[PDB]
């Protein structure tokens, strides 16, 4: 057998070879099976002769090969044969398949697809043939003899694959199956066929098997259809995530799901490394553009992918823009959706990219390192780009929200990942110490939060300590923020504390003022946190007890600082003031310092106080002014020195009651009274005088505060208090804002004492005051004036001035007292002050809103509608009994209180309706001739309304009024003409921006109709609105121009709606909705517009922007009508 085939190969073709074949016909099965079992290399050349013994020139040759090929295949898979034998066989089979005719290849490949149905091959090595078979097929474009011939080599190869995809691939070989398509050239349809079929399997595999498959899928994309490969993987995991996240609302999977996702992400980033198109495609795909997409575009998974893709340099800048710009879009849209009811009806709420990226951080816990570097780096880009800027140098909602998300990413990453903890910190600090005048405050806040989170990590932190060396070189605002935030570390690390002391010790010696001003802030801060235990008889820390570990702090620690600080009292006035403020804060926290601080304050007054009883200028105000070389400065703001000594004394008496102190506090009490009685009695010369004036004004304002808190009882002291105001007012007339020296706690107490407090024995208390009556609204002027100053900055003059809890308290105290007076001219001020209160509480203290409303007596919305009722009732009262000309001022700010409060009302709410409908009532049933009042009532009306239904009812109706009461060439002539004109125009313009966004939204999709018909009804009611105005005469000054701008906008909106249908009807019918209202423009608008422009030129003796708009509007109607269906444009001219 064997040997006799060896001659045929060395003899010649045909006769020798082919004849022996026809002789056998029986078993090439039993022969080949056992011939490899004997020797595999004797079988190795067994084919080469037999294959050249059966060419395609003869059928018995060709139709014979088909049997051999099927036997080789059968053995390779079933047999246990060694891989050298196995791979030698398919080596030959692959290299001899070249010349097989079209009919046979189809049969061979269909035998594979046949195997695919159900087989245990254990070998895909059989499948390695498939690629060579399918390609050899496509080579021949000629019909082949099979069945109905009718088909080229390309089509049988397409239908073969087509079937391979419809048959089920077994779980075992499917990897090898997909690596088979690796070598086979494909059509885009064949690609998307193989791809989308491989995807259908993902949901059927145990999770740990996907990463290798995804790898095997991605190698196909390289030749293939990138977008669909990616979109598939992404879409699969996005959905998978969705389910897991709903399991979270009701660790278990998290290990697997996210570890796999990481590996999968790690796999596709790896591909993007080898093939850039893959990357450029991932970006092209994910890129937002029109905003309907970026909501469905980005998901936590794809974002994590993008962030891990960051590691490949070239893609970094791009990944960040995509994310950066999507964070803004995501927000700015949701910011819009909350603004209009109609948008809510058409568009459902969407998880915003913000909370998505945060979920990436959250999910990053499980083995995603590759994702962190890009994470922290992105968080910074937000804080960098969106941080506050020009506020330091003489809708930012997005700017803020972006910047905060930058911080949140950064904070939360820090919490979750130990390994980057240091780099985050170093990165924050290095900006703080290194960055310009450019405001760093947002960075200090994060620094504060990181520390506050776990002070234990950074207790050592030389990187914090090393920061202190720049303490003098940094702006005071920074140094305070740095120190304040760094506190929890100081209480822990001794070496950091001692190092700060040593730094501050010599900071005090800096010639530069600002340097010393910092050094002081530092020591003052130290004193707040540090005790001694000394030689003695919020729980600060004892610096003294460890003497082996502290080379700096001793028992002298507290006094050592006070002495160091004493020297600043002889320095610039600006510093002394800062030291006065500090002394009080410090005294309150440290009891032992009472003597040392008081001593210092005492001996300071001694310089400015004339001891000789009754030399009528009881304080020497000449020494408060220094003059060097043509310039007169005030040093030592005496009025604060007094306030400080006042608040300390008040404290010492108040608090410490558990000797040389009692002699101090008596002698100062003596001095204050002495000053009390004796006190009631441009160009350099005058520049000094003006200072002294408001010095006294303060001094009196301080003595007022003191003599009150001295005793709240006697008529005799209130007689002085009035006389002290009589001195203050005296100079105040002779000539003032934040200058109130009254501590806010006092401004609270006395306003609560004056109005609410009667039940106390003395009516003479009130009367000595009420009867002056200028003092009455002066005391209401300080409060109203400090609340205002409280919205300019966050601070307030005196003690507990920056304490946000003490401020909130004082706000609650003051508010309900102003409410008592307004339920019952001073009563006007109370409202004005009452107004500023609410506005502050809401835009600063917002989370405390619930607390706030309680002090005044769904539950939050309850308190709101309760207060609203009381106000809306006294507005109605002002109107119902209104006498001729009454108040444009009280009616104005009474509405302001309502508008402020109405923002607390839930947009759904039963209570919200009470406010909206009530407002709608005042609009119909009233009018008045002061423009101030209507614009407010309208804004409030609109404000509430647009959260109910689209305004296009009010709009169309409001125009019918102005249109009727003006022109054609309840609000009256003086009302609606200049004012209520501009409002409906502005309001409608916004309603157009809405439509514009809707219109652009639908275009971007490449439930839809439900919106389109709402867009029509929206635009339809709006055309009716403008027609009223375009008819009517309006004052030529402004409203003319505003109506023009508003008009050209509709034409741009309609044009946008038009070229949208130019797009949508390329894939087409333009239903009655569209049509009917298209010519409703060319009837009610177009002609009426042309007539309005002539009104302007005939009266008068921007403009071109209206015509171009109408022209372009028609230019695309001409293109629309022609290229789609209807002659409507020809019906617009009729």
Swiss-Prot record:
One of its GO terms (cellular component) is DNA repair complex. GO terms for biological process: DNA repair; positive regulation of protein ubiquitination. CDD domains: FANCI. One of its GO terms (molecular function) is DNA polymerase binding. The C-terminal 30 residues are probably required for function in DNA repair. Homodimer. Part of a FANCI-FANCD2 heterodimeric complex that binds and scans dsDNA for DNA damage. Interacts with FANCL. Interacts with MTMR15/FAN1. Interacts with POLN. Interacts with UBL5; the interaction promotes FANCI homodimerization. PANTHER family: BC025462 PROTEIN, FANCONI ANEMIA GROUP I PROTEIN. Belongs to the Fanconi anemia group I protein family. Pfam families: FANCI_HD1 (PF14679), FANCI_HD2 (PF14680), FANCI_S1 (PF14675), FANCI_S1-cap (PF14674), FANCI_S2 (PF14676), FANCI_S3 (PF14677), FANCI_S4 (PF14678). It is found in: Nucleus; Cytoplasm. Plays an essential role in the repair of DNA double-strand breaks by homologous recombination and in the repair of interstrand DNA cross-links (ICLs) by promoting FANCD2 monoubiquitination by FANCL and participating in recruitment to DNA repair sites. The FANCI-FANCD2 complex binds and scans double-stranded DNA (dsDNA) for DNA damage; this complex stalls at DNA junctions between double-stranded DNA and single-stranded DNA. Participates in S phase and G2 phase checkpoint activation upon DNA damage. There is a cross-link at residue 506 (Glycyl lysine isopeptide (Lys-Gly) (interchain with G-Cter in ubiquitin)). The modification Phosphothreonine is found at residue 861. Monoubiquitinated by FANCL on Lys-506 during S phase and upon genotoxic stress. Deubiquitinated by USP1 as cells enter G2/M, or once DNA repair is completed. Monoubiquitination requires the FANCA-FANCB-FANCC-FANCE-FANCF-FANCG-FANCM complex. Ubiquitination is required for binding to chromatin, DNA repair, and normal cell cycle progression. Monoubiquitination is stimulated by DNA-binding. It comes from Mus musculus. This is Fanconi anemia group I protein homolog. InterPro entries: FANCI, FANCI_HD1, FANCI_HD2, FANCI_S1, FANCI_S1-cap, FANCI_S2, FANCI_S3, FANCI_S4. Keywords: Cell cycle, Cytoplasm, DNA damage, DNA repair, Isopeptide bond, Nucleus, Phosphoprotein, Ubl conjugation.
């Amino acid at each position: 057998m064997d040997l006799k085939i060896l001659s045929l190969a060395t003899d010649k073709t045909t006769d020798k070879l082919q004849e022996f074949l026809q002789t056998l016909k029986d078993d090439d099965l039993a022969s080949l099976l056992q011939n490899q079992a004997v020797k595999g290399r004797a079988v190795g050349t067994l084919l080469r002769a037999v294959l050249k013994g059966s060419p395609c020139s003869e059928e018995d040759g060709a139709l014979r090969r088909y049997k051999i090929y099927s036997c080789c295949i059968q053995l390779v898979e079933s047999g246990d044969l060694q891989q050298d034998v196995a791979s030698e066989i398919i080596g030959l089979l692959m290299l001899e398949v070249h010349h097989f005719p079209g009919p046979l290849l189809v049969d061979l490949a269909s035998d594979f697809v046949g195997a695919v149905r159900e087989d245990r091959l254990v070998n895909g090595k059989s499948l390695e043939l498939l690629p060579i078979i399918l390609t050899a097929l496509a080579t021949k474009k000629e019909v082949l003899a099979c069945g109905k011939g009718d088909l080229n080599g390309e089509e049988y190869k397409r239908q073969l694959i087509d079937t391979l995809c419809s048959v089920r691939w077994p779980q075992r070989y499917m990897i090898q199956l997909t690596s088979v398509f690796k070598d086979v050239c494909l059509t885009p349809e064949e690609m998307n066929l193989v791809v989308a079929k491989v995807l259908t399997m993902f949901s059927k595999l145990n999770l740990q098997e996907i990463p290798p498959l995804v790898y095997q899928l991605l190698v196909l994309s390289s030749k293939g259809s990138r977008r669909s490969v990616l979109d598939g993987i992404i879409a699969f995991f996005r959905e998978l995530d969705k389910q897991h996240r709903e399991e979270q609302s009701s660790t278990a999977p998290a290990d697997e799901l996210y570890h796999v996702e990481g590996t999968v992400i790690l796999h596709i980033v790896f591909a993007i490394k080898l093939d850039c198109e893959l990357g450029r495609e991932l970006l092209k795909h994910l890129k937002a553009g029109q905003q309907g997409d970026p909501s469905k575009c980005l998901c936590p998974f794809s974002i994590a992918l993008l962030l891990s893709l960051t590691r490949i340099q070239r893609f970094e800048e791009q990944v960040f823009d995509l994310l950066k710009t999507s964070v803004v879009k995501s927000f700015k849209d949701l910011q819009l959706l909350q603004g209009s009811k109609f948008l809510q009806t058409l568009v459902p709420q969407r998880t915003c990219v913000s909370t998505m990226i945060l979920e990436v951080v959250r999910n990053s816990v499980h083995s995603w390192d590759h994702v962190t570097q890009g994470l922290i780096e992105f968080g910074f880009i937000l804080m960098d780009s969106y941080g506050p800027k020009k506020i330091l140098d003489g809708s930012k909602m997005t700017n803020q929200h972006a910047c905060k998300l930058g911080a949140n990413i950064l904070l939360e990453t820090f919490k979750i990942h130990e390994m980057i903890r240091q780099e985050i910190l170093e990165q924050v600090l290095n900006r703080v110490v290194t960055r310009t005048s450019s405001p760093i405050n947002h960075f200090l806040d994060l620094f504060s939060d990181i520390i506050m989170y776990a002070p234990l990590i950074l207790q050592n932190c030389s990187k914090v300590t090393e920061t202190f060396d720049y303490l003098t070189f940094l702006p005071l605002q920074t140094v305070q923020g740095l120190l304040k935030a760094v506190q929890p570390l100081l209480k822990i690390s001794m070496s950091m504390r001692d190092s700060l002391i040593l730094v501050l010790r010599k900071a005090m010696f800096a010639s530069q003022l600002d340097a010393r001003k910092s050094a002081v802030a530092g020591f003052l801060l130290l004193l707040k946190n540090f005790k001694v235990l000394g030689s003695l008889p919020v729980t600060q820390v004892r610096v003294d007890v460890h003497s082996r570990y502290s080379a700096v702090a001793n028992e002298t620690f507290c006094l050592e600082i006070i002495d160091s600080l004493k020297r600043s009292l002889g320095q610039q006035a600006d510093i002394r003031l800062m030291l006065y403020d500090g002394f009080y804060d410090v005294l309150r926290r440290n009891s032992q310092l009472a003597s040392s601080i008081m001593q210092t304050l005492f001996s300071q007054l001694k310089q400015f106080y004339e001891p000789e009883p009754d030399l009528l200028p009881p304080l020497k105000l000449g020494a408060c002014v220094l003059t060097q070389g043509s310039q007169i400065f005030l040093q030592e703001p005496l009025d604060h020195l007094l306030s400080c000594i006042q608040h300390c004394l008040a404290w010492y008496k108040s608090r410490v009651v558990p000797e040389e102190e009692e002699e101090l506090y008596s002698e100062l009490d003596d001095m204050l009274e002495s000053i009390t009685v004796r006190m009631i009695k441009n160009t350099n010369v005058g520049i000094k005088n003006n200072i002294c004036a408001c010095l006294i004004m303060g001094v009196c304002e301080v003595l007022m505060e003191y003599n009150f808190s001295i005793s709240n009882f006697s008529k005799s002291k209130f007689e002085e208090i009035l006389s002290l105001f009589t001195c203050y007012k005296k100079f105040s007339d002779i000539l003032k804002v934040s200058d109130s020296l009254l501590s806010l706690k006092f401004v609270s107490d006395l306003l609560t004492a004056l109005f609410r407090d009667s039940i106390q024995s003395h009516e003479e208390s009130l009367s000595v005051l009420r009867s002056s009556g200028e003092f009455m609204h002066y005391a209401v002027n300080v409060t109203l004036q400090k609340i205002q100053q409280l919205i300019r900055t966050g601070h307030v003059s005196g003690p507990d001035g920056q304490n946000p809890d003490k401020i909130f308290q004082n706000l609650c105290d003051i508010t309900r007292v102003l409410l008592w007076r307004y339920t019952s001219s001073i009563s006007l001020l109370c409202l004005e002050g009452l107004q500023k209160t609410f506005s502050v509480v809401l835009q600063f203290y917002q989370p405390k809103v619930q607390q706030f409303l309680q002090a005044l007596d769904v539950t939050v919305t309850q308190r709101a509608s309760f207060q609203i009722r009381q106000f809306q009732r006294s507005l109605l009262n002002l109107l119902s009994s209104e006498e001729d000309d009454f108040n444009s001022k009280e009616a104005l700010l009474l509405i302001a209180v309502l508008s402020t409060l109405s923002r607390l009302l839930e947009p759904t709410s039963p209570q919200f309706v009470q406010m909206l409908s009530w407002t709608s009532k005042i609009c119909k049933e009233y009018s008045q001739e002061d423009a101030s009042f209507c614009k407010s009532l309208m804004n409030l009306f609109f404000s509430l309304h647009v959260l109910y239904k689209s305004p296009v009812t009010l709009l169309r109706d409001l125009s019918q009024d102005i249109h009727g009461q003006l022109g054609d060439i309840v609000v009256n002539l003086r009302t609606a003409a200049p004012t209520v004109c501009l409002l409906v125009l502005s309001q409608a313009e916004k309603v157009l921006e809405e439509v514009d966004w809707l219109i652009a939204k639908i275009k971007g999709s490449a439930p839809t109709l439900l919106i389109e018909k709402a867009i029509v009804m929206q635009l339809g009611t709006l055309v009716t609105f403008f027609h009223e105005l375009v008819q009517t005469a309006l004052p030529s000054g402004s409203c003319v121009d505003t109506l023009l701008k508003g008009l050209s906008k509709i034409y741009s909106t309609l044009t946008a709606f038009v070229k949208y249908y130019l797009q949508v009807c390329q894939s087409s019918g333009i239903p009655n909705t569209v049509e009917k209202l298209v010519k409703l423009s060319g009837s009610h608008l177009t002609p009426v517009c042309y007539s309005f422009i002539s009104y302007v030129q005939n009266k008068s003796s921007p403009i071109p922007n209206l015509v171009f708009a109408i022209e372009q509007y028609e230019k695309f109607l001409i293109q629309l009508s022609k290229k789609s269906k209807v002659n409507l444009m020809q019906h617009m001219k009729l």
